Design a protein around this ligand. Structure first.
Ligand SMILES: NC(=O)c1ccc[n+]([C@@H]2O[C@H](COP(=O)([O-])OP(=O)(O)OC[C@H]3O[C@@H](n4cnc5c(N)ncnc54)[C@H](OP(=O)(O)O)[C@@H]3O)[C@@H](O)[C@H]2O)c1
Ligand SMILES: NC(=O)c1ccc[n+]([C@@H]2O[C@H](COP(=O)([O-])OP(=O)(O)OC[C@H]3O[C@@H](n4cnc5c(N)ncnc54)[C@H](OP(=O)(O)O)[C@@H]3O)[C@@H](O)[C@H]2O)c1
Lengths: 351, 351
């Protein structure tokens, strides 16, 4: 065991020098001796990024490979052994792994309590994960996955979730996928708040509906916004008191309907969890003066939010929805355990 | 004086229907009768967006116009008379105007107290401003301006600043450009906070240095970050207690230097005011646990911040720097009046 290791992982950066593992081109994936603050994993499955996976598979077909499953297998071994990680050299994507804990450093910053043998999922990108592929058992082209045998490093700054046996299935990775959303909502929503959730039928949306209603309480008002009227029962069943029918890009409609349902006082907290562009200005206009607008979605444009609010003189706070929060996986899993309505919907939708 | 007018200005939207003035293609620029909540301006100068201005001038030179000032003038009049506003039809950029107040609706939501005849600048984009150009006196090709005779509408939701009588105007207009930054810093920085300002020598940086230090107080710590060693005296003279020499993209150096200067405690508030990309992760890594990272610059990428913080498990708050805040023009101008050092530095650089 080697001592004084960087939680950000610079001790495993080979090329170039003085950059973090993610921007690094070549990482040190030598799993024979670990650092004091690292944690080693016996990798079971690689969930590759769907655009990265699709991109590599096509490039192998354009070079005239016949056996795509082996060619992808061939591509993975060469990529990881040369660069130390499965960072797509063209798109710069990656993914996550599922494995079992293999060794734990003495000075490892423990987040979720795990021991050797625990089955954990990774919530950080493969583009920063030291990875060594010893064998490729299967290459599922339709599942963007690889059944392998290898090992990976989690730095002390890394993020992982302990996968439960009592919760079965891939219920958890669909939850870990959006676990940062409900954890953040419970920090934002006060008792008696009026909450507007735009994209209230989505994966993270319905989790936000439930947590928002729990926090705002009996005298709070949770208002969903959805594009399609077939979604109204689900929004109300997952916590919305009222539901608006509008395109998330329809700023004027959403404003008048929120104003009507709140007698012109508007929302204290607006949660945006749609996957569409040009919904920044509608989200801003649903909020009251000095209200909170929380952007969770990757379709959010920084510039449209920052300048949009200026043009209409909207003094509201606009926060970038962090993908991580302390205990966000435990909290999101707890939410499904406490909320039977959500649990069923998740098992039906993302089993 | 027509009644029941929308503060967002939808009552002047001709094409298409049910969109805000900004995305609208054609606005109603009929200045013969105003609405009850609007304010009419006799425009003196049009400061067009420099990318929009440059693009139009080039488009006119590639179409083979000889008299460029005369060609630009006709392009402005035709665009405004056809569409009602000076929104660039290709890039979608506008700008700002300077004028004197001509008429004030009785139901106009007055922010800064102004009367008829007061010389005001507008802080909302020309891309949403109903504008009618009756004459183009001058077309300053090197200064991105047009000395015109026309009129513009300000909606109740618009933002404007009264040009001060006690001050200059080359100076005052330069401050409104960044007035949202010092106003926001005053809300974020608590007494005894450690404040890190990335881009500490810039226009907004020096305003942020001063506001951070007065708010953080004698037992607070204000740390500037600059690439160039010639900037340390200005950074320290405008409020920084310490200055780090590093590239804003150098996460590891900035992290080690903030840690060294704070005995591993890091910053309570990180203010990012560089207009360089790939500074999200350095800003995040300078913050302490649960600290605040405020992104003011338009070079900020939403996804790089949102995913960047996740990969290193940084549970920090990331705020989108709103371009507007209540009384932000008065607050930034007051800052220059109390601080002679800022005033002197501003007069030299921006006049
Ligand atoms: N950093 C993180 O933690 C993280 C992780 C994953 C995803 N995200 C981002 O956060 C968002 C949450 O996505 P998700 O996982 O909840 O997937 P999702 O279920 O697809 O969420 C999006 C929902 O919004 C609705 N919607 C989309 N466009 C709309 C529009 N124009 N008008 C009205 N409704 C609209 C969709 O319903 P209909 O299309 O049926 O109307 C959809 O159900 C994603 O956009 C993603 O970019 C963030
Ligand atoms: N109303 C609006 O349009 C609006 C509203 C909100 C925010 N903003 C944005 O706020 C941002 C702040 O810019 P500003 O005009 O206030 O300041 P600025 O005058 O553009 O200065 C930026 C400063 O950052 C310094 N810096 C230090 N290290 C750097 C590095 N590695 N890369 C780049 N710069 C570095 C620069 O010094 P060097 O000379 O060494 O580079 C420069 O002094 C702008 O992006 C602006 O677009 C605009």
């Amino acid at each position: 065991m080697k001592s004084n290791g960087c939680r950000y992982g610079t001790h495993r950066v080979i090329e170039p020098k003085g950059v973090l593992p993610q921007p690094a081109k070549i990482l040190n994936n030598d799993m024979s001796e670990i650092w004091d603050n690292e944690m080693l994993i016996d990798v079971i499955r690689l969930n590759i990024d769907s655009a990265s996976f699709h991109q590599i598979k096509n490039k192998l077909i354009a070079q005239g490979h016949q056996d795509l499953e082996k060619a992808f297998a061939e591509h993975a071994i060469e990529l990881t052994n040369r660069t130390g990680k499965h960072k797509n050299e063209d798109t710069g994507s990656g993914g996550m792994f599922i494995g079992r804990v293999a060794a734990i450093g003495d000075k490892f910053e423990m987040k979720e309590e795990v021991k050797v043998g625990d089955k954990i999922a990774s919530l950080v990108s493969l583009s920063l994960t030291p990875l060594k592929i010893n064998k490729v058992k299967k290459v599922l082209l339709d599942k963007d996955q690889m059944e392998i045998e290898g090992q990976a490093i989690l730095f002390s700054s890394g993020v992982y979730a302990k996968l439960p046996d009592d919760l079965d299935e891939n219920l958890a990775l669909s939850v870990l996928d959006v676990a940062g959303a409900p954890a953040q909502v419970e920090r934002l929503v006060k008792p008696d708040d009026t909450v507007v959730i735009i994209g209230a039928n989505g994966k993270s949306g319905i989790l936000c509906n439930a947590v928002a209603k729990e926090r705002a309480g009996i005298c709070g008002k949770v208002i969903g916004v959805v594009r399609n009227e077939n979604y109204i029962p689900t929004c109300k069943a997952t916590g919305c008191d009222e539901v608006i029918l509008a395109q998330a890009t329809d700023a004027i409609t959403i404003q008048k309907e929120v104003s009507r349902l709140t007698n012109g006082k508007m929302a204290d907290v607006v949660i945006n969890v749609v996957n569409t562009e040009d919904t920044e200005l509608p989200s801003i206009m649903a909020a009251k003066d000095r209200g909170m607008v929380y952007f969770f979605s990757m379709a959010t444009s920084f510039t449209k939010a920052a300048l949009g609010a200026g043009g209409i003189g909207a003094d509201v706070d606009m926060m970038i929805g962090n993908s991580y929060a302390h205990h966000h996986s435990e909290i999101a899993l707890d939410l499904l355990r406490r909320n039977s309505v959500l649990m069923k919907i998740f098992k039906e939708r993302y089993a």
